[PDB]
Design a protein around this ligand. Structure first.
Ligand SMILES: [Ca+2]
Length: 78
DNA sequence: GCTTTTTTTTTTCACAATCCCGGTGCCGAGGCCGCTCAATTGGTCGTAGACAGCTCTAGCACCGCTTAAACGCACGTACGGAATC
């Protein structure tokens, strides 16, 4: 009955947190802190989270509404 | 071995759709009536085909050559289908 709680951590989650936010939103900075809130402070995972972007359009998971140079305002169904 | 972490999975909860009930009423299944016309009865008359008795067609069995076709193997090319995009 204590503090730590958070995510399931991959493309099951990049699709779940982007959908677990009630509405649309920007960048690596929104998605990672929702994914690292439990206590696992970000170390080497920084390249691993970063990679997910081409992996999502190539495998067809999130369309990006906004964003250019490692920024991406990712969408699901409206 | 042991973390660091995919995927896989399971769990959970919310939503939508379909499933099952009783209530209601409307109408066509069902059955009855009376009359009709088509099935039955009891009659005759002729021929369709059953049957015996015959013929002799063609279906079956057999036999021995001469191939042409079938069989098996060696080899490798291009096709099927699996994986990714
Ligand atoms: Ca008769």
């Amino acid at each position: 009955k204590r503090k730590a709680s958070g995510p399931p951590v991959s493309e099951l989650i990049t699709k779940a947190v982007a959908a677990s936010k009630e509405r649309s939103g920007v960048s690596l900075a929104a998605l990672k802190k929702a994914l690292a809130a439990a206590g696992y402070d970000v170390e080497k995972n920084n390249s691993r989270i970063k990679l997910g972007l081409k992996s999502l359009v190539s495998k067809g998971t999130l369309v990006q509404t906004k964003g250019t140079g490692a920024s991406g305002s990712f969408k699901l169904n409206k």
